[PDB]
């Protein structure tokens, strides 16, 4: 059963997420407008969306129980390596299997494979990303499991450059145990069948997506002309 501490963790993570993820997507109006027709016509809008989302992921991360006990340098390394992954995970909330797209409240803010390819990426990465979203959606995670997964993804002890890897592991373990116990107590079968193992598998899938993303980002941001379309935060976090 869920200890009081574990119920505490879930309460905090649910709240941290509610304060960093606006389901009405009201702020999208502040982003450079999307252009759908210039093989990079969607880059300004999506780069802004990503930059905005990186900020939200950071705000979420700071509220993770135990994250505070980490050093500044370890916090930076965890966020720099997990950002794109948490953005992919958090995006599952707007992803819809109806037409394989991310529905953010309006046709203008509804993205599909065509839109993403107009941000400077190829199917080498987009197809796997869509496949990832569909598999994750089919897990019908409870919001509780969704927030714990994102937290577990952020506090990963094996990210390169990590110093106090054991502290990072201790912090992660506490989240994992909360998750495993939560599934056993609050998630009814059959939906709970190997659900933990399947969630950890998505993290593995994210490592592959992260890897391919780093390669394509290098390519895209290779020409100063395109890196010029990004934001200062996106450049600092993803590199260059």
């Amino acid at each position: 059963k869920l200890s009081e501490e574990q119920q505490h963790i879930i309460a905090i993570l649910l709240d941290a997420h509610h304060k960093t993820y606006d389901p009405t997507y009201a702020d999208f109006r502040d982003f450079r407008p999307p252009v759908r027709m210039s093989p990079l016509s969607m880059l300004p809008h999506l780069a802004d969306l990503v930059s905005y989302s990186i900020q939200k992921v950071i705000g979420f991360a700071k509220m993770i129980p135990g994250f505070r006990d980490l050093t500044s340098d370890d916090q930076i390394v965890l966020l720099k390596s997990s950002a794109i992954e948490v953005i992919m995970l958090r995006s599952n909330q707007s992803f819809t299997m109806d037409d394989m797209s991310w529905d953010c409240g309006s046709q203008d803010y509804k993205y599909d494979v065509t839109d993403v390819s107009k941000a400077g990426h190829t199917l080498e990465l987009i197809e796997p990303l869509i496949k990832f979203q569909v598999g994750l959606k089919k897990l019908n995670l409870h919001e509780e499991e969704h927030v714990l997964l994102m937290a577990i993804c952020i506090v990963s002890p094996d990210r390169p450059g990590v110093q106090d890897a054991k502290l990072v592991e201790a912090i992660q373990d506490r989240l994992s145990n909360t998750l495993q116990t939560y599934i056993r107590c609050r998630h009814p079968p059959p939906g709970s069948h190997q659900l933990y193992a399947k969630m950890i598998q998505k993290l593995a899938d994210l490592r592959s997506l992260n890897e391919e993303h780093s390669k394509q980002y290098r390519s895209l941001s290779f020409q100063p002309e395109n890196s010029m379309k990004l934001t200062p935060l996106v450049l600092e976090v993803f590199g260059n």
């Binding site: 900020q55 950071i58 930076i76 966020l79 600092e236 976090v237």
Partner: peptide
């Protein structure tokens, strides 16, 4: 390796 913006946001 300097991430001033990321650091400022992490607090």
């Amino acid at each position: 390796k300097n991430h001033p913006m990321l650091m400022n946001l992490l607090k």
